[PDB]
Ligand binder design. Structure first.
Ligand code: HEM
Length: 315
């Protein structure tokens, strides 16, 4: 996949295959995402309400308060791992983000957490019960419904939960990358957790690509695209651009600065994702002097970069 990106960056940065436009290089990838006037995400107050809530619940002071909870949750999750043979995705990568968002949203843990995680009129009742939890715990969108406002809140709740899949993938991708390149001891001894997670974001981005729609007739590079044309933007490719990232195919855990476009356009749950991953790796690296990878299964999706299974043995 990345060899294809290399050649396309070299020979056709902006490319039309007959069906859809595709962008591979960093400069043009960045331009498409940031130039929101020319390139649309459609095909805003709901977005602004999301941004307003993200400020409230993902503030630096709120996340700094949660650090100890996240650590103990992580620590508790690792205790249920079988050192001889066990799945990292099932035991750590999937649970931690859901437990942490459940603490933030105020979703019920324990017996209801098993049932609520798994989840028309019976479903609708649970959907309203779900909203009721967040309503009770909390922000503009919570207070405004304390029917369109109710659906708006329900929609944002689903988003805030759903986004944690990429965080799950980042943890898994990090474990794979640090193990294959044998970086654990180095990251541990040199305190590269922060940068190594960012390098894992650049190198193994949970979201491989995104789409934009041309608002007007625009020109990018040598090419010129018309209105109503969908522009595929390969984030994974942009992250390996040689001009921006020297030795772009190399995994450098102390790479700094690392202006990857893995989060896209500011992304709301990025500080949260980073924190969860940082603490996940830190606590995990403490329990394992040695990590052997036995079996892996990728997620069957061209858009997402992650693992359905990651079976490991620990010392
Ligand atoms: C490693 C973790 C994550 C990665 C790599 C990631 C990546 C992305 C990317 C690439 C986009 C598309 C943005 C664009 O097209 O410009 C996106 C959108 C979004 N992500 Fe994430 N994401 C992560 C975690 C989360 C989390 C934890 C949440 C919520 C709790 C979240 C909520 C969203 C939402 C709501 C959108 C659409 C609206 C927006 O861009 O603000 N994501 N994400």
């Amino acid at each position: 996949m990345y060899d294809w990106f290399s050649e396309m960056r070299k020979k056709d940065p902006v490319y039309y295959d007959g069906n859809i436009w595709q962008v591979f290089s960093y400069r043009y990838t960045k331009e498409v995402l940031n130039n929101f006037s020319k390139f649309s995400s459609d095909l805003p107050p709901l977005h602004d309400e999301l941004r307003s809530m993200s400020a409230d619940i993902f503030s630096p002071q709120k996340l700094q308060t949660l650090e100890t909870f996240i650590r103990e949750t992580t620590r508790s999750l690792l205790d249920s791992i079988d050192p001889r043979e066990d799945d990292i995705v099932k035991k750590l990568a999937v649970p931690l983000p859901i437990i942490v968002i459940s603490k933030i949203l105020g979703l019920p843990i324990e017996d209801k957490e098993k049932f609520k995680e798994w989840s028309i009129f019976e479903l609708g009742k649970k959907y309203l019960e779900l909203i009721g939890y967040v309503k009770d715990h909390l922000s503009g969108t919570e207070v405004v419904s304390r029917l369109s406002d109710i659906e708006k809140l329900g929609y944002i709740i689903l988003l805030l939960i759903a986004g944690n899949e990429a965080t799950t993938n980042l943890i898994s991708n990090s474990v794979i990358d640090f193990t294959r390149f044998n970086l654990w001891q180095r990251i541990r001894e040199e305190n590269l957790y922060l940068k190594a997670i960012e390098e894992a974001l650049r190198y193994s981005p949970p979201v491989m690509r995104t789409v934009r729609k041309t608002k007007e007739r625009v020109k990018l590079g040598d090419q010129t695209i018309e209105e109503g044309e969908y522009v595929r933007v390969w984030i994974a490719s942009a992250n390996r651009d040689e001009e921006v990232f020297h030795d772009g195919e190399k995994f450098i855990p102390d790479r700094n600065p690392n202006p990857h476009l893995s989060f896209g356009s500011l992304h709301l749950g990025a500080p949260l994702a980073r924190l969860e991953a940082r603490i996940a790796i830190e606590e995990f690296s403490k329990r394992f002097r040695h990590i052997e990878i036995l079996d892996t299964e990728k997620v069957p999706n061209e858009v997402l970069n992650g693992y359905k299974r990651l079976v490991v043995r620990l010392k």
